[model samples]
Target: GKALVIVESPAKAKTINKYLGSDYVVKSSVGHIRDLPTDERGALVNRMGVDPWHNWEAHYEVLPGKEKVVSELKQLAEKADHIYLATDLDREGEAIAWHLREVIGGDDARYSRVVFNEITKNAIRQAFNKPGELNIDRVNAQQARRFMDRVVGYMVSPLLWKKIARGLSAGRVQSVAVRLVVEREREIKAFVPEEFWEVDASTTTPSGEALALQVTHQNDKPFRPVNKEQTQAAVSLLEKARYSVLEREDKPTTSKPGAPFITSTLQQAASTRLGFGVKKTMMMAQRLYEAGYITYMRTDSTNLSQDAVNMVRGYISDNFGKKYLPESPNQYAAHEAIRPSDVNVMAESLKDMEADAQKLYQLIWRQFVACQMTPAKYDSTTLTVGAGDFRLKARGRILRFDGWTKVMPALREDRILPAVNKGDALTLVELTPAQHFTKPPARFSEASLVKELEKRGIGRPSTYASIISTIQDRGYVRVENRRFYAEKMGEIVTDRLEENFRELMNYDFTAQMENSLDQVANHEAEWKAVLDHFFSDFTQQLDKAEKDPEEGGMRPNQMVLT
Candidate 1:
């Protein structure tokens, strides 16, 4: 009989089946098959799939509509010589494999776990050839995280429903994210704009090279005109001023490519550069990953495997010349960067790929190749223009070497300046005074939101997309012109939570919990012990807010802020 291989998607099953030949029966779990129960009965018995008073015991059931999947897998397992859990290599994937093992029900020796970062034929072969057992520690970490999220959601969501509107949900991370948006809105409301003015001189070299210069100083002091009168006075002085290049400074500079794409960086770049939202970017990336065009899409690692590095360097040497190749392979240190499985296969070369997938693939391919290439070189020049009592400044740069830009070209053009001596004369074309007001901080675009979430360590690489999606899904925030704006309910709920559960809403506390979870994965800490410490504090807060409602706790009809 053939060996049975289980994966998370039909797309992956098809590809792995092709690689494994007729000796294996490849099947898809179609994503997660088991989750904590959400039905009313399960909720009444287990308090949303976890018993808080009983060691935080979690009860999971096969997700609705996955019974057929489990049944078919069991029948297949009855005849197979051995079952292989070929799932994604991450905590979530590990948990799934463990669940399958529990549900399949056979001798432990009859099962093996195989993992790979990519789905290439070689990677699949290698993984099966040297199979291993499940990692209980990683599985425990996943369990801990799930139970914690459930406790917070089931326990706190009801309070929100009672305090504000019904059907409102709260999460350990999502609530904090809502708070961030709400607090930013508060800052925007409190911002006071200050008026300012600027004086610019449009001049040119005697050789007719144009220079756009901004006045930096006047009479040897910083030149900031806070009013139109001061600006016009400076403009009047500059209108008749004889401009000349006083001093020029040229400095050699080099710019290295950004590190290869991690999950957060990939989502951020796709959002900003390609106009793809975080959700859409992850969707396309998932397809690319399943199609074998890229590595796993969900990873925090910037690592590039040695073989991948060799392939990239070889490609760079062959196509772009040897100069672009680095002296030694770039070493990055978990699973690996989300990179092209095959460096030589350009996005245009792929057949039968979606247009959006093609665009995202191209992005990942170029970023991976560029990361190991030589840095771009430039000669940056700064010129001081002396016009009467005003010291004006103009800056320009010349590209000395394209380097990595050969693959990922710089977005902005280089500002090349005209060759001129220190004392060369300049003729003023125009002198203008401009008025401006200091603006408030920009609303968090989806891109910047992801960056901020990643920066604050509020969520893991795997949960950022969902965290952002959940907030919007729950009507906590609304997106307007690609920026997040807090809704009335969002602000109300956040203020209530902030007032009551102050520590839970704090950024550092949430990040600290993540660290504690990481320690659980590392086998340094017991999962339940971590939860025990948290529950002790969490339960007290819940009781205080729920039982003692007179201490400014939110009331059903009362507004949060008046």
Candidate 2:
């Protein structure tokens, strides 16, 4: 008997079909063939705070222009004896799969669902063998999230139109994110900077080696004077005396390898290392995931599979040495992190693992390996230079062991120091002082936005990228070289939303909404109850605002109270 497998994209179907062989016929749904229509204002809240729609109908249109391809898929499904849904593994993926299943009715016994994280022969074969039923919980969670977003957008957009101008929109996550931007802008405007001074002495060792030292001590004790007058007095007192090395202290320090790249960290590192924006990095990561080069790219967990750990351990042992490997593999605790439930699945859309996908996979693989490796060891040396009446200290470091750096070699930053003993007289060298101004805190970049969202519990691992994209798309914010800059429209929208809907725009409240979604995912709470509770209170607030927009205005204190 032949099986028809429906996936989200043509590339995915093509790649997966190669691995599944002739028994399975693969087809693409070309993304959500069904969604709430833009032309129709769908759901309306009744007196009981429940949304009632006259048309409980779902709009299914061939995505823009995939009609011919969709028709081909329909024909293929009819000819096949069984059907399988192989969409992505997220809630949205589950929704797409469910939609496909509904559109293609077949014998219940003949239908199945399969998921793989990588598009490789081994991963695909394993998935087909371990077929499962549809994940309704995941679909329901997606539905809840979508409904919540729609409710906010539908109700709030009209309000925006009434107060500001037409064609304005607001979103559940986006509005909160905008409020954060507006608050930061206020902080920057109200900031007051203070001025301070520091002194450095330049001298050479008895062996004629040059050294620069910061003024850290006076009368054999640490000294720190804040004013310019105190600094000048100290400098005058120290310029006339004989100079010598008073003491030398050396200590070994080890820097443990950082945790593996989660979704946020990956975006951050890409920004810092490759100068890639958050959207660009995530797009590349998605391609890499689809090509079967990395595990799910939208996870917050730094967890590695036992087999992945073993594979890297063996690679390190064979290439480097056993000493580099940790005594026990590093096992990270799941501290409210975003990790997928299934670790064995791989993205099956990737046809080959040799190109850009391989490069990214290697990067991720090396990072994971390095996370489980031993820390790099270095010897830090502190030398006290006493010249005339002035006291100064110089620090230097030398790497004693490479450890994880042997594999990743990108984090080495130690400088070696010359051998010098106590009581060694050092000659005076050129002294230099450069003025520097205190810098303001940087504005949020896409990577930093994701980090902030995670820190505030405002969004999920899966939603971080989309949240950044949506706000930017709505012209609320514009990204320049990976940094977020609020546009004119963005600032206006933010101010209006925060001032009018303070509770709805509060960061904590938004975060609670995210946590409530997580609760649904964990099966600890009913999705309907979470939606009902939120809508019930939200609609009451909406009704009050609709009745009297002037009285509904929120004060700055109310908006900024945590």
Q: Report the Cα RMSD per candidate.
A: 2.7, 5.4
- Estimate candidate 1's alpha-carbon lDDT, on a 0 to 1 scale: 0.86
Assess each prediction's global lDDT (C-alpha) against the native. Answer: 0.86, 0.71
The weakest ten consecutive residues by lDDT in model 2 span 334-343
Candidate closest to the true structure, highest lDDT:
1
Reference-based lDDT, residue 183, model 1: 86
Q: Compare the candidates by TM-score and give the number of the best one.
A: 1
Candidate 1 lDDT, tens digit per residue, 86-111?
88898998999999998888899998
Name the lDDT value of residue 517 in candidate 2: 79
Q: Which residue ranges in model 2 land beyond 4 Å of their true spot?
A: 39-71, 218-228, 242-244, 334-362, 385-391, 409-414, 430-434, 553-562
Least well predicted 10-residue stretch by lDDT in candidate 1: 38-47
Which segments of model 1 are wrong by more than 4 Å?
39-43, 207-209, 240-242, 409-414, 559-562
